[PDB]
Symmetry: C2
Subunit: 377 residues, 2 copies
Amino acid sequence: MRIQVNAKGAARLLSRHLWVFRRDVVSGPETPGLYPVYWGRRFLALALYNPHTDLAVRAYRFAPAEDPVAALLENLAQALARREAVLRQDPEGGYRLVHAEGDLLPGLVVDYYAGHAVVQATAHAWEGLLPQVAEALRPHVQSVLAKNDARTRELEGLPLYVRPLLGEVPERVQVQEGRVRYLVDLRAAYLDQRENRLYMERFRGERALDVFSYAGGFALHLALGFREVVAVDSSAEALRRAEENARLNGLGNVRVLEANAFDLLRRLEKEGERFDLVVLDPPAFAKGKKDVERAYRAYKEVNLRAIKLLKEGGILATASCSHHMTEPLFYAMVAEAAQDAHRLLRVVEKRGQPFDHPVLLNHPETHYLKFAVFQVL
Amino acid sequence: MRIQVNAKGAARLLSRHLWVFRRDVVSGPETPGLYPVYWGRRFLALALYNPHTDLAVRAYRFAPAEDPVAALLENLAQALARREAVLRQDPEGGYRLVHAEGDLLPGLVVDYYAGHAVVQATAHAWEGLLPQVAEALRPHVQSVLAKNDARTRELEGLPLYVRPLLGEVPERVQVQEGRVRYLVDLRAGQKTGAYLDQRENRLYMERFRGERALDVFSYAGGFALHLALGFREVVAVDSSAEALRRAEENARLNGLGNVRVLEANAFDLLRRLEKEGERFDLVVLDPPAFAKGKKDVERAYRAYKEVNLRAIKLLKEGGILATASCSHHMTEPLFYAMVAEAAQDAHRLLRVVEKRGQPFDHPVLLNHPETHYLKFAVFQVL
């Protein structure tokens, strides 16, 4: 069998985007799986297919190949290969080994936490290939956990469950990141901010504010260069993990603080508090193109306040991991904030996703992380 | 002596942009110099000013100072201070010590080439302060040249001249850049063979190895030299024989026989190389601005697209593309949009390897868009 798409679908795949939605599919199999995609008689690509979803086609090869399963597994091999260097040198670190579309492996995510891998299949065809995936990873892990409990799978028509795939999967594991260690509960920070947290180690000062600290990943690194670091978050559970990570590192200069970021910030300003550094690691504010509007204003407000709390010469590390918050808008938003706060900011560095979370230029949606460091003059 | 600006001018200085043009100035001195800027009775900033130019106000301090000259010089001191670390570690390297607006020192540029500095002023007030400028430099330099021959100086009603400010200015200097060295021409009327804002980008290219590498728009072959260390053959292309001349010279200076120059028109040569079926492991595009004005963006975009498109078509599966743009007009978003269109039209998937820009010694101010002009991107063709 094979998939047939209209001219629009063909165009998208010609321009090398990996996705073709329902509305552009003319015909195709009645069962999910791996099939060739065709525009009339013209071959376009090999892809993961699902007849019951809006996102029906996810390409992973733009070249025919006998045995589509073999080719998908080749892609897997290459993905792991790109990370061999690091897994050798830093066996105890945390790295993503498979980053879905970015690694030409749609619907599959695989992370590495100091020897223990967590697999996340999100496309129907990955479901019966897990054993193969486990067998592929095995040479580098001591465990493999199929963490297939994401709601996104229902949409595909898949079951939810977390079950070991290979070896003995620990309950929790300690991950080494630069000069600090943190705890990962393999069952329940995120690796895409790994290199940005490490960057924070180049700064020193009196006080550092870490808004939206989560498990305090940024705090941990900052505690090495500042007398005091204040990790803020709305979740007690989060700050709980933050204190625990703090203790695991023998860091007593890290102070948690349950609070609503937007309010607290206005507060530290009114009370006249000021800092040497402020990190802004907000959670996606937009759940769709619709929210962008309001999202933009939310980011501006927080960024504006953050800027107002910084001393002359202070550092601002602000970010966004939302898909709908484009890089251009992100930087426009920071600039607006800086302007309204009547403060001059020098760019210290613009960063994004690290090498293990690949970005494809032709597939915009693979780019979501924006991280920037500024100095307030 | 004060400078009065309208609400528009005030807004610009409030948002922290350093420039206020003629149209927004209500009143001010009759002679160029350093003066306070006010909106009514409200103090806004200290600034270099010129009564005879479209760009009249160039702020350098958004806080009152009793001695405008002293404050400007403190800015200079701090600019030099930010480069202290590197001047000590790499005394033989090439670094910009003062990057005009980026260092809150409008109308002043100073570069450092292994001990020899070159000063460039393009705003009136800086002229009488040149002697003090060579002073602050003295401890860090062997000599200081005053290269004041840029046409822009005429708008400011300033004389065009090239002349030493301190010490003995060499006619040529060898600069060390990582594992390579190159020649910088300080001789009057000669192009400084160095483009310091690409220093860290060239160095980056040392991480690649392969068979063939193509260096489109190689100038003095700076990128070529670094590539020569990892590829069997590097082809430096440029439309200037003079340029390729300095390229071959820099090549010999490093004992590199794997670097081959090639005088030619980039746009055509690229199309040709496709037809003869030529494919490389890595290619680099360092196009000269294609916009002498914010009105040529249109045509410029098309220009970049065509060349990028061609470059992509010449790359092997897994090849590397390092493309860039040093034009203020070609905005970052536009640049990435055009590379994307190119990749799309060429039906090739590009994985981002790294997005880069200007180095630390060429400061960018978020509130002053114009200080941002260099875009350098590395992609891998899958």
